[PDB]
Amino acid sequence: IAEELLRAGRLDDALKALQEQVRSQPSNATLRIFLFQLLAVMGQWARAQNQLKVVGELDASALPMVQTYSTAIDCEALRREVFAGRLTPVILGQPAEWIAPLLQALSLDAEGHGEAAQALREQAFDAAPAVPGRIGEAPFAWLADADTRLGPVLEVIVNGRYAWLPMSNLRSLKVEAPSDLRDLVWLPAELTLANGGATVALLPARYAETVEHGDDAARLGRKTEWLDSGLPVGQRLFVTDAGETALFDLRELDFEPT
Amino acid sequence: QKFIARNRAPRVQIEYDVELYGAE
């Protein structure tokens, strides 16, 4: 029943139903695995973390998941602060000069200087290099996030820490369709850096304002849209000179060497 | 025009059936 409520996108109803299941069978680790993931989709971070702890205690084999995703949930809170201009994200790989105006634009927006913020983003975008490549076999001349606050930057969680990765620091990305409910929130990815490094990563898969300002469908990544405020909610979307690809549909992305 | 989405209309997406009970 909770399963079917989830499928219908009825999150509140699904949660109510699932909590009653857990209450009925409180030592069933699998119900608590469902519950943690559902709470994550709903953005109830502390409660999702609570369930992970209990999962860890019931099923010790689940402990590496518990470690990975409890620190992923901590990172999801840094996101709100980052996009509110209150927290500086670290940058992985070679420093990119044009990140600085992007970050300053976030803090100028927060102070109500939207014109000055737009001026800095325009300068950042001008400076950021168009790098050609391929999505699968389909070529592009440039690629960026549809979120103008990011442009050609990828949000990542790597080794337990939130970061921005300039796309010009990226050589390739490989991702599969989402498989588990938690994958709607954090899509697993294999990254290869322009500098040679390779790392597994988690990609925050929804825009940060989705939890507070989206609907259930946006929280489930079943749509992407822009609010009257101009901010996007729902599933991450990449745009190119030639088309667009939503993150859940991306499989292989490659950039041509500079 | 680089890096700019030309359209900000809502996007309908492919929906994925996902697993609910697995931790590996």
Residue numbers in the entry:
A (entry chain A): 30 to 287
B (entry chain B): 8 to 31
Task: Give me lines lifted from the publication on this model.
We crystallized HsiE1 in complex with a peptide corresponding to the first 20 residues of HsiB1 (1MGSTTSSQKFIARNRAPRVQ20) or an HsiB1 degradation product, which appeared during purification of the E1-B1 complex. Both the E1-B1 peptide and E1-B1 fragment structures were solved by molecular replacement. In the E1-B1 complex structures, there is clear electron density for residues 8–20 of the extraneously added B1 peptide and for residues 8–30 of the co-purified B1 fragment, respectively. Both structures are nearly identical to the structure of HsiE1 alone, with an r.m.s. deviation of 0.4 Å in either case, and to each other with an r.m.s. deviation of 0.3 Å. The B1 fragment (residues 8–30) wraps around E1 in an extended conformation (main panel), following a prominent surface groove that originates in a deep hydrophobic pocket between the 12-stranded β-barrel of the “ImpE fold” and the two α-helices just preceding it (left inset). The B1 residue Phe10 nestles in that pocket, which is lined with residues Phe154, Trp171, and Pro181. The amino group of Lys9 of HsiB1 interacts with the negative dipole of helix α7 and forms hydrogen bonds with two carbonyl oxygens at the end of that helix (residues 155 and 157). Another key residue for the interaction is Arg18 of B1, which forms two salt bridges with the carboxyl group of Glu273 in HsiE1 (top right inset). In addition, most of the E1-B1 binding interface is hydrophobic in nature, involving Ala12, Gln20, Tyr23, Val25, and Leu27 from B1. Here, we have solved the structure of HsiE1 in complex with residues 8–30 of the P. aeruginosa HsiB1.
